[PDB]
Design an enzyme around this catalytic site. Structure first.
Site, short mmCIF file in Angstrom:
data_model
loop_
_atom_site.label_atom_id
_atom_site.label_comp_id
_atom_site.label_asym_id
_atom_site.label_seq_id
_atom_site.Cartn_x
_atom_site.Cartn_y
_atom_site.Cartn_z
N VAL A 75 52.24 -8.28 114.32
CA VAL A 75 52.07 -7.70 115.66
C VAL A 75 50.70 -7.57 115.88
CG1 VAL A 75 52.30 -5.74 117.21
CG2 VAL A 75 54.23 -6.48 115.87
N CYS A 76 50.06 -8.03 117.15
CA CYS A 76 48.65 -8.05 117.26
C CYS A 76 48.58 -6.79 118.29
CB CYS A 76 48.11 -9.31 117.92
SG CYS A 76 46.25 -9.43 118.09
N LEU A 77 47.97 -5.66 117.76
CA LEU A 77 47.77 -4.46 118.58
C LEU A 77 46.39 -3.90 118.45
CD1 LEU A 77 49.18 -2.59 120.71
CD2 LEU A 77 50.06 -1.10 118.89
#
Length: 158
Positions: free
Chosen positions: A92-94
């Site tokens: 996940v890219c957060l």
């Protein structure tokens, strides 16, 4: 290095155990024979009610380094989900998961998890981790909706 790390993890679960959002799951994978791995948690995130993600219960793995809480955890959806900010590998890219972006040692597993839940229905077009999901989301929202609904069903409790 570790130790400092384990101290925090050890504290994190105690906190969560006391209070966590209804529906979410977060627990350390059992190392064989009674032991335990606090640096590997299996969690789950409920779809947010009122959105096409509603009803699905998504499993994502949370891996920590000895740096912790120096560096943030790597969070992988298992299996990967069709979403513009989830790489094909499930990562996940957060921004709060970036050391140079908004990561802060005080961030809570609960804040991470909640944060992730809110990204599901509110994707961030600025960081296109997943191209396909990104393409369709921009030039075909009806399709994007079709695929998400299916996905939420595919993982709903039964």
């Amino acid at each position: 290095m570790s130790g400092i790390a384990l101290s925090r993890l050890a504290q994190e679960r105690k906190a969560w155990r006391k209070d966590h959002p209804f529906g979410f799951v977060a627990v350390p994978t059992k190392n064989p024979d009674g032991t335990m791995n606090l640096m590997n948690w299996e969690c789950a995130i409920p779809g947010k009610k009122g959105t096409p993600w509603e009803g699905g219960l998504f499993k994502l793995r949370m891996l920590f380094k000895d740096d912790y809480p120096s560096s943030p955890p790597k969070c992988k959806f298992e299996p990967p989900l069709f979403h513009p900010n989830v790489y094909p590998s499930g990562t996940v890219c957060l921004s709060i998961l970036e050391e140079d972006k908004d990561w802060r040692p005080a961030i809570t597993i609960k804040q991470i998890l909640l944060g992730i839940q809110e990204l599901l229905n509110e994707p961030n077009i600025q960081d296109p981790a997943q191209a396909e999901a990104y393409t369709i989301y921009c030039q075909n929202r009806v399709e994007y909706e079709k695929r998400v609904r299916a996905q939420a069903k595919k993982f709903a409790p039964s």
